[PDB]
Enzyme design. Structure first.
Site: not given
Ligand SMILES: O=C(O)c1c(O)cccc1O
Ligand SMILES: [Zn+2]
Ligand SMILES: O=C(O)c1c(O)cccc1O
Ligand SMILES: O=C(O)c1c(O)cccc1O
Length: 257
Positions: A61, A116, A91, A103, A195-196, A93
């Site tokens: 992802h 993030h 991570h 996002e 956000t996922t 996006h």
């Molecule tokens: O979607 C997210 O923001 C997220 C995180 O910020 C940390 C772990 C899993 C995750 O889906």
């Molecule tokens: Zn994120």
């Protein structure tokens, strides 16, 4: 399983994760004119000197740079936060083109990418108990625009070719996340979500106003990653952003006049 394609992307997630249509989902558009300065916000404190990075993982992802969170080492406090939050991973996006990728948006403007830095509230013991709580997480969000190269991003860029496909990881010790920050800590904050999937409503969002600049070459290398696993047809890891969600009964507060 879920992703960012036509068939498994953001508009489908609600079927397995109904909270996708919840009351405090992220990201959102930040209307700068409607955001109110909040004099009740304490100074933000980002203390990363003791951060201990471990590994970088392509999870199919995005990629996560993971930290040792077993001691009080890299913490976020102050601003809207009560108590201390511990860095666990960061991570990004990003888009297939420089015109999209973030996002959150700012007056509907999309940046080329968004970083993030994820932290959990140390009152809750670890991340897994923190995501059972409405103040379990604090995510520091940082926009990326395309322009000059960001030097502190280059060691991430240079390891990507070793984690091209889903499930691959690499050692990623002695990385200093201070090199990903802009000069100013001016920010917007609001209560929201991951956000996922699983889209849990646990997050105090702190989105910095100043974007960092990365080079076109650095973001082009993000776009060479794969969503697929080794040996599978290539589906480039691009456009792994969820679009803005309804604000609902929320207010976005500014740290600055
Ligand atoms: O979607 C997210 O923001 C997220 C995180 O910020 C940390 C772990 C899993 C995750 O889906
Ligand atoms: Zn994120
Ligand atoms: O994220 C995904 O899983 C995905 C696909 O499976 C197919 C196309 C685009 C995409 O993001
Ligand atoms: O870091 C943790 O301690 C953790 C997770 O990262 C995910 C689920 C449960 C958990 O304790």
């Amino acid at each position: 399983h879920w992703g960012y394609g036509k068939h498994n992307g953001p508009e489908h997630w609600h079927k397995d994760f109904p909270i996708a249509k919840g009351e405090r989902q992220s990201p959102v558009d930040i209307d700068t004119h409607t955001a109110k300065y909040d004099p009740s916000l304490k100074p933000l404190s980002v203390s990363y000197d003791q951060a201990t990075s471990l590994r970088i993982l392509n999870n199919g992802h995005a990629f996560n740079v993971e930290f040792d969170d077993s001691q009080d080492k890299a913490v976020l406090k102050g601003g809207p936060l009560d108590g201390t939050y511990r860095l666990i991973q960061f991570h990004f996006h990003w888009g297939s083109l420089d015109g999209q990728g973030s996002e959150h948006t700012v007056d509907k403007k999309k940046y080329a990418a968004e970083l993030h830095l994820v932290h959990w509230n140390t009152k809750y013991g670890d991340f897994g108990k923190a995501v059972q709580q409405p103040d379990g997480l604090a995510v520091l969000g940082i926009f990326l625009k395309v322009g000059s190269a960001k030097p502190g991003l280059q060691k991430v860029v240079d390891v990507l070719d070793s984690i091209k496909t889903k499930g691959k990881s690499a050692d990623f010790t002695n990385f200093d996340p201070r090199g990903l920050l802009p000069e100013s800590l001016d920010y917007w904050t609001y209560p929201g979500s991951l956000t996922t999937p699983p889209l849990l409503e646990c997050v105090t969002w702190i989105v910095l106003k100043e974007p960092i600049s990365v080079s076109s070459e650095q973001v082009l290398k993000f776009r060479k990653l794969n969503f697929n696993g080794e040996g599978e047809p290539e589906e480039l890891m691009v456009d792994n952003w969820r679009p803005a969600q309804p604000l609902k009964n929320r207010q976005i507060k500014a740290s600055f006049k």
